[PDB]
Amino acid sequence: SSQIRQNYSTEVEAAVNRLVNLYLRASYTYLSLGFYFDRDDVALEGVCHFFRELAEEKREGAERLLKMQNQRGGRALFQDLQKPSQDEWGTTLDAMKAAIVLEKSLNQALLDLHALGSAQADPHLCDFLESHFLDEEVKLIKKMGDHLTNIQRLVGSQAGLGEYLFERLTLKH
Amino acid sequence: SSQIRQNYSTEVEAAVNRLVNLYLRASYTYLSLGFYFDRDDVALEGVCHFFRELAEEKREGAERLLKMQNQRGGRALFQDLQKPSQDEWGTTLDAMKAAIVLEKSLNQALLDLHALGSAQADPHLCDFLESHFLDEEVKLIKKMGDHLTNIQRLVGSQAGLGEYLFERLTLKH
Amino acid sequence: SSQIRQNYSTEVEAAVNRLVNLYLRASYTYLSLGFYFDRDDVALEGVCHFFRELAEEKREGAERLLKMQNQRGGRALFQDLQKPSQDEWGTTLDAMKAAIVLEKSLNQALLDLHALGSAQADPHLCDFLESHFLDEEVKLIKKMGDHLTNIQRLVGSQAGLGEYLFERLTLKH
Amino acid sequence: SSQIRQNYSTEVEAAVNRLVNLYLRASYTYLSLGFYFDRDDVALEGVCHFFRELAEEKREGAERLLKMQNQRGGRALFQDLQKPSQDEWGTTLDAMKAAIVLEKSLNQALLDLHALGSAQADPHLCDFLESHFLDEEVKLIKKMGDHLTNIQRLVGSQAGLGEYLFERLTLKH
Ligand SMILES: [Cl-]
Ligand SMILES: [Cl-]
Ligand SMILES: [Cl-]
Ligand SMILES: [Cl-]
């Protein structure tokens, strides 16, 4: 057992393990989104790349949380990773909307954990979220909102054309 | 006559000469496709470049097969090269569909020859196809399928615009 | 739907999706093993690093399989990822034994899929496994067997000492 | 007197001076630990180096606190520095246990001051601790816990051997 644990509640420890599960599920969802856009009958490379990069970012978030859990003397505990909510993800617009919903749910989980840390007077936890998660999440959601607006303006009456142009001229490929 | 030939059936030798003919015909077809898209009344440079590059790749496939034929102690035999099936190739979409049909026929010829090699217990032949042809063909067909989907999404109700944009923003020029 | 699919059976497609699940589960198991050895009350950095590297390798194997699925015109389908079989992994010896068992199960899944590919006359699938998985797996299992033998010789009557020395002098840190 | 002081309570000012005393005492304790392990009849250079480095780190922590005190318009006040609690520090294990106890007491002092800063609505103080002390302290305690576990596993039935090996193969020398 730990000889280091100090000011680290069982409630926070458990919530950290739940958040790890949420980040890994998000990673898995992004893996599925990425491979959908790589299908020969979808074929939007920039969109594929965007979601593959997010799968990696979310995995890295989970790893940082697990590292912190150990640094504090908590015990990492893993649960089943539920499959993503969809097998096919529709249009780029459908996918970017689903991504924003996912990100808002993760952001709310971060905020909930920050509030728990504040209530438990755990400033290391609070600082850790502030320093590595909260601003990164606000930036990502701003970026997704920006994309969504551009996708929306391009639908118009020529949806295929707009979907191609967004992928070619906004997303990295 | 050969002093080297070993485990190399007459059936395989003949099939290799037929495949050489098929690759050279494919090369010739791609030469014609390339020069069609270079016409002043077609003028799609990226499309021209794509097919010219494929003419070269298919010629190189034929040369590798002829080199292998000699390495095994078979006898290269050449036949008439039939002219391509069309003198004019329609739209970029028409051309990319015709290319996928051609590639599937070549892929089936590779698979047929692999099966013959397996039946004849000729592992060098089988390995040679695996190492230099089968994956290259799967990759090319994936690429063509990706292009076809993008061309298709761009037709919409403004076909000229979409054909220009695909050439400008997807194909190398 | 796919315009590219050729010689790619539904049986192989399904088996590829199952193998992806197996690789991702293996990745998850290695993630858990790695974080266990990072605990302050275990504290074997070289062992942690070894398993973290394997988590990454297994994820990359899954990604290669998913890429290939798309190249062939199959449909990636994801299932629930079961949690690892243990929450605590015992000694370095216990962990390396569990890793070898896992690797043998993955190797058997690769062999089973190769046999299915041979029966279905799918040489691209067979080549793909040969080129990227089968030798990599044999090498890894040889390496694990080598480690296991060294761990075993070091138990003797001073288990702590031997566990420390293996981590310090064999594993990268 | 200060023309700059703003939102900086007398309670915080006093607690900052006490924390400076605690950091300087910790520095002094580490100086003594370092020179003990440099004795010809102890002679564990890696252990000496570890504690000498910590003496320097704790002095630097004190200096940062004194700099901040001035930046806020508080008045640095120094008290007697009590000698360390021991003149001889036993084994490496005894020393690393004593170091962890010391570090936990410093960590609790940081947490107490953070709580005081929160209660007094002094966000600069709170941020200052978060940014320069709280994570540094968690990392150091994790490192000490890791060392303690390795020292403990090496005692076994050959204590001298284990103490030598830890110093040679874990600590920098
Ligand atoms: Cl379960
Ligand atoms: Cl003739
Ligand atoms: Cl389900
Ligand atoms: Cl005095």
UniProtKB/Swiss-Prot annotation, chains A, B, C, D:
The modification N-acetylserine is found at S1. The keyword Metal-binding applies. It holds the Pfam family Ferritin. It is found in: Cytoplasmic vesicle, Autophagosome; Cytoplasm; Autolysosome. GO terms for cellular component: autolysosome; autophagosome; cytoplasm; cytoplasmic vesicle; ferritin complex. Oligomer of 24 subunits. There are two types of subunits: L (light) chain and H (heavy) chain. The major chain can be light or heavy, depending on the species and tissue type. The functional molecule forms a roughly spherical shell with a diameter of 12 nm and contains a central cavity into which the insoluble mineral iron core is deposited. Interacts with NCOA4. This is Ferritin light chain. It comes from Equus caballus.
